[PDB]
Amino acid sequence: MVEAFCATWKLTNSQNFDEYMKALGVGFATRQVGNVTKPTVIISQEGDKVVIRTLSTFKNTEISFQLGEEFDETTADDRNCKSVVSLDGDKLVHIQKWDGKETNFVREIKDGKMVMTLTFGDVVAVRHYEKA
Amino acid sequence: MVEAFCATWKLTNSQNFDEYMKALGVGFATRQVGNVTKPTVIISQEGDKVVIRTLSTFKNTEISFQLGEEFDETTADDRNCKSVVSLDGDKLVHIQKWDGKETNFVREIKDGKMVMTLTFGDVVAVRHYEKA
Numbered sequence A, B: 001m002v003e004a005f006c007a008t009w010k011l012t013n014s015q016n017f018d019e020y021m022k023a024l025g026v027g028f029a030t031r032q033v034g035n036v037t038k039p040t041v042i043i044s045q046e047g048d049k050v051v052i053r054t055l056s057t058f059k060n061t062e063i064s065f066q067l068g069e070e071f072d073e074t075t076a077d078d079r080n081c082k083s084v085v086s087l088d089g090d091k092l093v094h095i096q097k098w099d100g101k102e103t104n105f106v107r108e109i110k111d112g113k114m115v116m117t118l119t120f121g122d123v124v125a126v127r128h129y130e131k132a
C-alpha cells in the first residue's frame, strides 16, 4: 500500500529516459540535465493526502494529492497537467493529461527498491531508486 | 575565478581525514568507507548557479547554488546544514552550519590540482584531486 512507498529515495539507475523525454517534447537542454541528475524523492502521508517531494539540481518539485482525486500539476518540464494518482494493487499509478495527451508513471516496490516505469505511447522508461 | 574549478576531479590523496571525521562526529560505519572511497567530483558553472556532483561507491550527492546565497544542504554524512559557498579571492569557501556548529571547506587550484582544506576547530584535513 502507500506505507511501502513512505521514505526517502535516491535514483540509482535510469533506462531509456532520454528517448522518453523526447517523446514528451522535452527540449535538448533540459534533456542533458535530465540525464545526469539523480533526484531524491521523499514520499510521505499528511493525513490521507500523499506528498511527493523531489530534490534535484534542475528543479525542486512538491505535489500533494488524494488517492483517486484529480489535481492540477505543473511538472518539471512545464507541462500543465490534470493528474490523478491511484492504487493499482500494490502499485501507485500516476496519470498526467495535458494538451489532449496522456502519459503515466507506475511506482512499485521490487526487491526493496522503488521501480518507476514511465510510458508515453510506444516509449517506455524505467527508473530505479534505493532507499536512503 | 569559478572557471578554474570547472572540470572533473578525482581524489588521489587525503591527509588527516579520519581524525577530521571523528572531530566532526561522523559515525564509525560512515568513517570506515570514508577512508577508502576515492570520489569523483564534477564542478560546473550553470547559468547563474554552480553545480557540484560527487560520485563514489558510498553515495552520490549533488548541490546547486548561487555564490553567497544560503541554501539547504544534506551532507553525505547526513548533516542537515545551512550552507553558503562563496569566492574568497581565487578560492571557493564552503561553510556548513548545523546544530550550533560549523565547519568549512576551502577549495583551491594549486599546481594544476584541486586542493581542499577541511577545518573543524583545531582539526584540519587536506584532500587532493587530480583533473581527469
Ligand SMILES: C[C@H](CCCC(C)(C)O)[C@H]1CC[C@H]2[C@@H]3CC=C4C[C@@H](O)CC[C@]4(C)[C@H]3CC[C@]12C
Pocket (backbone or CB within 6 Å): A011, A021, A024, A026, A030, A033, A034, A035, A037, A038, A039, A040, A041, A054, A056, A058, A059, A075, A076, A077, A127
Ligand atoms: C523531463 C522533465 C523534467 C526534467 C528532469 C529532471 C529529472 C532533472 O528533474 C519531466 C518528465 C518526466 C518527469 C520525471 C519523472 C521521473 C522522476 C522521478 C524522480 O527521479 C524525480 C523527478 C523525475 C525525474 C521527474 C522530473 C520531471 C520529469 C523528468
Ligand SMILES: C[C@H](CCCC(C)(C)O)[C@H]1CC[C@H]2[C@@H]3CC=C4C[C@@H](O)CC[C@]4(C)[C@H]3CC[C@]12C
Pocket (backbone or CB within 6 Å): B011, B021, B024, B026, B030, B031, B033, B034, B035, B037, B039, B041, B054, B056, B058, B059, B075, B076, B077, B105, B116, B118, B127
Ligand atoms: C565525512 C563526511 C561524509 C563521509 C565521507 C564520504 C567520503 C564517505 O563520502 C563529510 C564531512 C566532510 C565532507 C566532505 C568534504 C570532502 C569531500 C569532497 C569529495 O571527495 C567528496 C565529498 C566530500 C567527501 C564532502 C561531503 C561529506 C564529507 C566527507
